[PDB]
Amino acid sequence: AFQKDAKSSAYSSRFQTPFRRRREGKTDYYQRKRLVTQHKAKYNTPKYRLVVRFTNKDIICQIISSTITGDVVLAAAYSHELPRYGITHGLTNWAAAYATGLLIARRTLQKLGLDETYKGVEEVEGEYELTEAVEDGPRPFKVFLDIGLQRTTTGARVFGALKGASDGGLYVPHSENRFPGWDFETEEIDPELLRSYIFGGHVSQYMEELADDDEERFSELFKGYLADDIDADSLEDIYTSAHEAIRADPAFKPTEKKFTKEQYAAESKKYRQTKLSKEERAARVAAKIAALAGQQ
Amino acid sequence: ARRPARCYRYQKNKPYPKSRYNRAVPDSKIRIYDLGKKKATVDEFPLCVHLVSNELEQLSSEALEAARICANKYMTTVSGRDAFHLRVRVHPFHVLRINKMQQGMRGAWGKPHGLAARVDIGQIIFSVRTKDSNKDVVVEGLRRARYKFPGQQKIILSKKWGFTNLDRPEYLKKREAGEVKDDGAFVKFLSKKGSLENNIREFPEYFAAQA
Amino acid sequence: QNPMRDLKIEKLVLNISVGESGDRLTRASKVLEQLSGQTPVQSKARYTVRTFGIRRNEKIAVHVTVRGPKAEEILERGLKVKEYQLRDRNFSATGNFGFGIDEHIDLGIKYDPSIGIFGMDFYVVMNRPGARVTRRKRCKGTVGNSHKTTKEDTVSWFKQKYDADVLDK
Amino acid sequence: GKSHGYRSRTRYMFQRDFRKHGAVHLSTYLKVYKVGDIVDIKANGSIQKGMPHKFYQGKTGVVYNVTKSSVGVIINKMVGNRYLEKRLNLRVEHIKHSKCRQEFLERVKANAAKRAEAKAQGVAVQLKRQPAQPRESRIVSTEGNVPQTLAPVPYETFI
RNA sequence: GGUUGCGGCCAUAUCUACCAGAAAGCACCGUUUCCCGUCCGAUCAACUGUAGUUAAGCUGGUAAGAGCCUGACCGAGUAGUGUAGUGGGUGACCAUACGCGAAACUCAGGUGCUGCAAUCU
RNA sequence: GAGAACAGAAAUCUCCAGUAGAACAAAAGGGUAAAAGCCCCCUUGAUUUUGAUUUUCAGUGUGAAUACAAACCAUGAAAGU
RNA sequence: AAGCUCGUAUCAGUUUUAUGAGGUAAAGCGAAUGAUUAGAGGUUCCGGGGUCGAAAUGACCUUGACCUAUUCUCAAACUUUAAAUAUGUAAGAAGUCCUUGUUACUUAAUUGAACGUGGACAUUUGAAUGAAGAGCUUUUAGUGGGCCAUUUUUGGUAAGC
Ligand SMILES: [Mg+2]
Ligand SMILES: [Mg+2]
Ligand SMILES: [Mg+2]
Ligand SMILES: [Mg+2]
Ligand SMILES: [Mg+2]
Ligand SMILES: [Mg+2]
Ligand SMILES: [Mg+2]
Ligand SMILES: [Mg+2]
Ligand SMILES: [Mg+2]
Ligand SMILES: [Mg+2]
Ligand SMILES: [Mg+2]
Ligand SMILES: [Mg+2]
Ligand SMILES: [Mg+2]
Ligand SMILES: [Mg+2]
Ligand SMILES: [Mg+2]
Ligand SMILES: [Mg+2]
Ligand SMILES: [Mg+2]
Ligand SMILES: [Mg+2]
Ligand SMILES: [Mg+2]
Ligand SMILES: [Mg+2]
Ligand SMILES: [Mg+2]
Ligand SMILES: [Mg+2]
Ligand SMILES: [Mg+2]
Ligand SMILES: [Mg+2]
Ligand SMILES: [Mg+2]
Ligand SMILES: [Mg+2]
Ligand SMILES: [Mg+2]
Ligand SMILES: [Mg+2]
Ligand SMILES: [Mg+2]
């Protein structure tokens, strides 16, 4: 870099590097410690996070516990599994985030055995609720939202996933004030709006308001909605049946997979440079001091 | 008002540097440690003769400077002010206190008085480089600075080229080869470690394995 | 190669350094408001000087940052006043550039003796796409050398479109 | 006058281990402690809460109790001519599981093995530990190895 | 083997300079009706996965590279040290006897390993 | 460090480098970097009850401190604190 | 002093083995901080001086400061490293393994946590050496000016200080 910039032996020597997952901007350890650590009188009782992540337009949902060797995925649901349930587009958005949580909620709670007891809320009117303790019977599965580095803003979709896992029957302690339709200037939740976000009616209203006010954009974005002949009004029943579809068979289809691991290893190792031997590297110096040095 | 140097001769106290905690200390009577032709090149002066201490004792700055005179004086007026490099190898960093003086012994911590260099056994006091033909002038030079010091010190012919770290044949082997290039009063050495790029930039006359 | 690396202008930041607060400074704020369209931001003195007649935290100088097309306009509209000739300085070795003009009247913008006359500092930050990598929250990285904005690359970009002149040496 | 406060004299004692500063790595809180474990006490300057006093630095004790963030440890500290029982309340950051018993736990399940696998064979055990014995006789060959005779060297200088 | 999400150890993972990266992924990337945040939709929030790109990130390789890690009868059984004497010396100090024993230095080798879940010629 | 009208060594604006060389009332020493520092938002846990524990020690007192129990609260989406 | 409860028992100003803790000695300074001798090579639109000059964000000497690779020397209140001596814990019957009870704590959960019922293995039963035994209670004297030697070590020129 810049000459009078850069770095000495002294600097580099005494430099204490951060962790890996901090040097990668991936992990907030201050909060990780406070999410993972268990009450020392609960001994080996794991503390299960809900890890909700957003790639560019894929949604990750993992219910995760920790171990000094690594973490442990109990169950995992990606929003790119939504095709199985009847959602082919816009699986990033708030109502895609919702359903993916409901998928993860049904999925784990099934392989746990709390499937038939603790169904959560089937209705989804969007009232504020967390899943209550069933009298003389198992307390619900308890899981804590791992937001990661996602910024907490009122309405953000990271809490969309929360609502689906919470409405799915998981116990995930939460307050209201970060759901869309949280009135800033009174502590009040408009549920008629929150339902609109669970079913996608903020996207449907974009479609409608872009039906008669422009078609240049309505074709650019919302392209695929044409090509499948889906225009707004049906969006509510799309997701409403996806919820039915999820609670009917959450069980996680893995991919058919096509080409064994050994196969993928083969082709991908072609494109991977391999290191050198000191003998090879010594020959590269001896070559240089032959040419470069001895006056051509 | 200088207490006889007998009083601080031995090393009785932990090192007492001038420090944030000391602050009041006077200045060393010896301020110049390099005399004669000290710009001179490493090849110019192969012959090295040290003044070496045989005691574990303390040398006052006032005795240091006074000997530095006597030695550099004898050498310039006989072999000439360019014929040698005298290097005082010992810096008086340690502060001697004194309890000056009404109560007698209450609260007796003294105030800085002079400075001294704390000297080991076998530790070099003076180092001189010249050419071999000047030897007997150099040696009588230090031999008189001897009289300026407390405690036995012995003069010693170095096995080394000047102030370099190498014995005379090993310096020759390295210098007739490419590995040695001039600097300052000292030299630098071609390292077989590091970036090959500017390893060759510097030391161009290597990378033949010839003259 | 050069597909996605082109050159966007990150932002243009105008700034007016006035030696006090009160009326003279709230006027310099009006200048930048109707010029930017976005409300401007005040700055307080960092310490006390008394030769510059300022107490620490005094409210010295308003400024504003403008992005996108709106900056191209105030760039060019002010670039005009300079007759499209900068200097070999004015361009940072880190790739941005800036100049200054007295009399804000000399680009658009009528007079109003209730608003006075103020000089400005025009500074323009250049960045290629994917500059977000430095500014985002997660995975905050740095841009590789073969991307980072240089002085060369910006002057050559300046001597081209806008058809201005670099001058000096 | 004199200064005897709680952390006095602890300059290097609570210092951080060069280039080891910063957060404590997460394993420290995943470790699990039960009553009866032997723990070693090393105070971590970064966590000021629940800190052991410097006397218990480098001291091993037995956990007597377990709380939210902490384990209680008992230590025999000897005052005068006797020992008294001190119980300490320590944050888990200052406490690591002790290896002091692992050579005993290794040797119990090992001595159990060679016990069964011997008796079921017809005895002949010897499972107590013995010290280093003097070595036996041996015959060293001269083959390829003839003694190389050394003598004392004279005085040199080389400085 | 690649990549991703969450990790453990926390430089053999960092730094500097260049070169290479298939598929998938990640990313950069497009929009501002909506919830939300800004002096500024850069950050942040929402919408699109459509309209673009491997340039950057990211992964890897190169360097008698800086650093860092490991090793060795390299230095050095040196410095220091526990023990001993009616040992040496005016002293300062030192030698010896039975033990323990570094650091620098020098030289050689090395440049992340790896847990869970998903995905991919 | 390199840039921008008056603007100068010192005014405000921008980019780059930056292992902390800063700051955290005060002495010094620890400690701290998506913090323990800076800006903002919400607050009164600086509260109630009565025990145990650590330093000083006689294992008295006082001072100060630690980790729980039982309330009532704060704050945060939350784990938590 | 009086004893008292027990007795191969349990005990130790000791070693060995296993596992911790420490920042003194040495060492280090072309590692941080702080000091210190010497040059060499660079960088200024820019600390000052001087020749050219109308000046210059001018060129040329120049002396400083800095930067770069070197060099001589140091630290009770500096330090990456880092001893020797000294120091914590462990070396079994109060042990280890199986089965599966109690609860109001804790778990998503008969999950765990704690305390247990029932079952398996004897003294080479788990290193050395020693043991005119070990454990325990009560009451009371005198003392509460100390001084000396080797080693460590502070103040003082020193002192039979
Ligand atoms: Mg070096
Ligand atoms: Mg750090
Ligand atoms: Mg946070
Ligand atoms: Mg005084
Ligand atoms: Mg003499
Ligand atoms: Mg004191
Ligand atoms: Mg006291
Ligand atoms: Mg506190
Ligand atoms: Mg591709
Ligand atoms: Mg590329
Ligand atoms: Mg990434
Ligand atoms: Mg290297
Ligand atoms: Mg003697
Ligand atoms: Mg000796
Ligand atoms: Mg007292
Ligand atoms: Mg006090
Ligand atoms: Mg100490
Ligand atoms: Mg020290
Ligand atoms: Mg020392
Ligand atoms: Mg060292
Ligand atoms: Mg230094
Ligand atoms: Mg310095
Ligand atoms: Mg000048
Ligand atoms: Mg012992
Ligand atoms: Mg016996
Ligand atoms: Mg007996
Ligand atoms: Mg009495
Ligand atoms: Mg009495
Ligand atoms: Mg008294």
Q: Which residues in A209-232 are b (16+ Cβ under 10 Å) and which e?
A: ebeeeeeeebeeebeebeeeebeb
User: Residue B116's closest CA among B25, B184, B24?
Assistant: B25
Residue C126 near residue C10, CB atoms below 8 Å: yes
Specify whether the CB–CB gap between D71 and D91 falls below 8 A: no
Return phi, psi of residue B156, to 5°. -145, 130
The most distant pair of C-alpha atoms in chain D lies apart, rounded to whole Å, by 75
Distance of CA C11 to the CA centre of its chain: 7
- Residue B97, helix vs strand vs coil: strand
| C-alpha to C-alpha distance for A256 and D72, rounded to whole angstroms | 54
CA distance B130 to B132: 7
Instruction: Give me the amino acid identity at B46.
Output: P
C-alpha A7/C-alpha A1 separation (Å) is 10
Contact assessment for residue A260 and residue A233, using Cβ atoms and an 8 Å cutoff: no
Q: What order of strands is seen across the sheet that includes strand B85-88?
A: B34-36, B85-88, B124-130, B47-53, B153-157
Largest CA distance in chain C: 54
In the numeric block, the tokens 């790119």 are attached to A80
Phi, psi of A61 (to 5 degrees): -135, 110
How far does the CA of A271 sit from the C1' of G30, in Å?
44
Subunits in contact with chain C (3 or more CB pairs closer than 8 Å): A
Chain D closest CA to B114's CA: distance in Å? 30
User: How far, in Å, CA of A105 to CA of A169, rounded?
Assistant: 6
Cβ within 7 Å of strand F: which of D 79-118?
Answer: 79-80, 84, 86-91
Structure tokens at C137: 């929250």
Q: How far apart are CA A102 and CA A167, in angstroms?
A: 7
C-beta of residue B41 within 8 angstroms of C-beta of residue B48 = no
- The closest alpha carbon to A62, from A94, A29, A31, A107, belongs to A107
Checking DSSP bridges between strand A49-54 and strand A144-146, what pairing results, if any?
parallel
Q: Structure tokens of D4?
A: 């005897």
- SS3 call for C63: strand
Cα(B118)–Cα(B60) distance, rounded to whole angstroms? 9
Token pair of D10, please?
């602890």
Residues sharing a CB contact under 8 Å with residue A208, sequence separation 6 or more, in sequence order: A232
Give ∠ CA A238-A240-A244 in degrees, rounded to 5: 110
B96 in Cβ contact with B8 (< 8 Å) = yes
Instruction: Show the tokens assigned to A126.
Output: 């969007």
C53 φ, ψ (degrees, to nearest 5): 60, 55
Residue written as token pair 């190898």: B89
Residue-wise DSSP of A172-190: ----STTSTTB-TTSS-B-
CA distances in angstroms from D11 to A19, A84, C132, D8, D85, listed in the order given:
27, 63, 45, 8, 27
Are A182 and A176 in contact by the 8 Å Cβ rule? The answer is yes
What CA dihedral angle connects D90, D96, D99 and D102, to 10 degrees?
90
Pairing of strands B187-189, B180-182: antiparallel
Give A 248-287 residues with CB within 8 A of chain B: 285
- Using alpha carbons, list the distances in angstroms from residue B56 to A20, B9, B11, B67, D17: 53, 9, 7, 19, 36
End-to-end CA distance of chain A: 30
D74 near A CB under 8 A: no
State whether D159 and B167 contact (CB < 8 Å).
no
Asked if B159 reaches chain D (Cβ–Cβ under 8 Å), the answer is yes
Which single residue is written with the structure tokens 């004299």? Answer: D9
Strands (E), chain A: 49-54, 59-66, 71-78, 144-146
Q: How far apart are CA B53 and CA B126, in angstroms?
A: 10
Non-local CB neighbours of D18 within 8 Å, separated by 6+ positions: none
Task: Name the strands in the sheet holding A144-146, side by side, starting at the edge strand that comes first in the sequence.
Answer: A71-78, A59-66, A49-54, A144-146
Our CA angle for B195, B196, B198, nearest 5°, is 80
How long is the CA A23 to C1' E13 vector, in angstroms?
Answer: 10
Beta strands in C34-118 (DSSP E): 63-66, 97-101
Name the region of A47 (left: φ>0; alpha: ψ -120 to 50; beta: rest): beta
CB A95 within 8 A of CB A203: yes
What single-letter amino acid sits at C117?
I
Q: Which residues are A16's β-sheet partners? A: none
B→A contacts (Cβ < 8 Å), by residue, are: 196, 200, 206-208
Q: What is the dihedral of CA A221, A223, A228, A232, to 10 degrees?
A: 40
Structure tokens at B46: 């192969």
**In 3D, which of A171, A141, A143, A147 has the Cα closest to residue A159?**
A147
Cα A160 to Cα A14: distance, rounded to the nearest angstrom:
45
Give the sign of the dihedral formed by CA A164, CA A165, CA A168, CA A171.
negative
For residues C100 and C120, is the Cβ–Cβ distance under 8 A? yes
Q: Which nucleotides of G are covered by protein (CB under 7 A)?
A: 16-24, 30-32, 34-40, 57-58, 67-77, 79-81, 87-92, 95-96, 105-115, 121, 124-128, 153-159
Cβ-proximal residues to C37 (8 Å cutoff; 6+ apart), any chain: C70
How far is B15 from A156, CA to CA, in rounded Å? 66
Burial of A185 (0-12, 13-18, 19+ CB in 10 A): exposed
CB atoms within 10 A of CB D154: 5
Exposure string (b/e) for D4-26, b if CB count within 10 Å is 16 or more?
eeeeeebeeebeeeeeeeeeeeb
**Tokens 């050419």 map to which residue?**
B131
Q: Which residues pair with residue A51 across a beta bridge?
A: A62, A146
Element holding B155 (H helix, E strand): strand B153-157
Strands B57-60 and B180-182: unpaired
C-alpha dihedral over A15, A19, A21, A27, to 10 degrees? -110
Phi and psi, residue A59, nearest 5°: -115, 120
Q: Taking CB atoms and an 8 Å limit, are D33 and A19 in contact across chains?
A: no
Give chain D positions within 8 Å (CB) of A16.
Answer: 19-22
Is residue C114 less than 8 Å (CB to CB) from chain A?
no
Contact C6, C128 (CB under 8 A): yes
D31 touches strand G (CB under 7 A): no
The answer to whether the CB of B140 falls within 8 A of the CB of B32 is no
Q: How far is D155 from chain B (nearest CA, A)?
A: 14
- Scanning residues 16 through 35 of protein chain A, those with a beta carbon under 7 Å from any atom of strand F turn out to be 16-18, 22, 25-31, 34-35
Tokens matching residue D139 = 């015959």
Determine the Cα–Cα distance for residues D119 and D127; give it in Å rounded to an integer: 12
Residue type, A175: S
Sheet holding B57-60, edge to edge: B57-60, B111-119, B94-98
User: Whose CA is closest to D66, among A44, A47, A39?
Assistant: A39
Closest C-alpha among B103, B75, B96, B76 to residue B16: B96
Is residue B67 helix, strand or coil? helix
* Residue whose CA is minimally distant from E64 C1': B196
Q: For residues B118-150, b (16+ Cβ closer than 10 Å) or e, as one string? A: bbeeebbbbbbbbeeebeebbeebbeebbebbb
In this complex, is the C-beta atom of D159 within 8 Å of any C-beta atom belonging to chain B? Answer: yes
C123 touches C13 (CB < 8 A): yes
User: What's the distance, CA D89 to chain centroid?
Assistant: 21
CA distance A50 to A66: 12
Return d(Cα A162, Cα A61) in angstroms, integer.
Answer: 10
**Residues 6+ positions from D103 with CB-CB distance below 8 Å:** none
Q: What is the spatial distance, in angstroms and rounded to an integer, between the CA atom of A191 and the C1' atom of G43?
A: 69
Among A162, A178, A157, A179, CA closest to A91 = A157
- Token pair for residue A229? 């002949």
Instruction: Check the CA dihedral D76-D78-D82-D86 and report its sign.
Output: negative
| Residue with tokens 């690591």, as numbered in its chain | D96
Residues facing residue A73 across a β-bridge: A64
Q: How far apart are CA D57 and CA D45, in angstroms?
A: 12
Bridge partners, residue D85, by sequence:
D76
Return the axis-axis angle of helices B61-79 and B135-146, rounded to nearest 10°: 150
Give me the CA B64–C1' F13 separation in Å, rounded.
Answer: 59
**Amino acid letter, residue B14:** K
- Nearest partner of C124 among C70, C167, C160, judged by Cα: C70
Please count the residues of chain A.
296
3-state secondary structure of A51: strand
Give the full edge-to-edge strand order of the sheet including D70-79: D82-91, D70-79, D59-66, D38-41, D95-97
- Integer angstrom CA distances of residue A138 from A42, A109, B207, D91: 18, 12, 81, 33
- Alpha carbon of B54 to ligand 14 centroid (Å): 15
HSE value, Cβ hemisphere, 13 Å, CA-based, for A77: 30
* Backbone phi and psi for residue C12, each to the nearest 5 degrees, phi listed first: -115, 130
Helix and strand element counts for chain A (H, E): 12, 4
Separation CA C16–CA C32 (nearest Å)? 9
Alpha helices in chain D (DSSP H): 27-30, 102-119
Structure tokens at D100: 């002091």
- What is the spatial distance between Cα D50 and Cα D144, in angstroms, rounded to a whole number? 66
Place of tokens 């990606």: A78
User: Tokens for A191?
Assistant: 């549920």
Alpha-carbon gap, residue D157 to B158, rounded angstroms: 8
Q: For Cα atoms B43, B45, B48, give the angle at the middle one, nearest 5 degrees.
A: 125
Q: Which two tokens stand for residue B171?
A: 């310096």
| Nucleotides in chain E near protein beta carbons (<7 Å) | 1-2, 4-11, 13-23, 25-31, 33-37, 39-68, 91-94, 107, 109-121
What distance in Å separates the CA atoms of residue B135 and residue B56, rounded to the nearest whole number?
28
CB B9 within 8 A of CB B59: no
What's the rounded Cα separation, in Å, for the pair C101 and C107? 9
Q: What is the largest distance, in Å, between two alpha-carbon atoms of chain B? A: 80
Is A289 within 8 Å of B208 when comparing Cβ atoms?
no
Contacts across the A-C interface (CB distance below 8 Å): 14
Q: Is the CB of residue C1 inside 7 Å of nucleic acid strand F?
A: no
Measured CA to CA, the distance from residue A94 to residue A206 in angstroms comes to: 14
CB-based contact A125:A195 (threshold 8 Å): yes
* D25, D29, D34: best to mutate for the A interface, most A CBs within 10 A: D29
Provide the resolution (angstroms): 3.1
Helices (H) and strands (E) in chain D, counts: 2, 5
State the residue for tokens 């410690």. Answer: A33
Q: Please count the helices (runs of H) and the strands (runs of E) in chain B.
A: 4, 10
Query: In angstroms, rounded to a whole number, what is the distance separating the alpha carbons of residues B152 and B154?
Result: 7
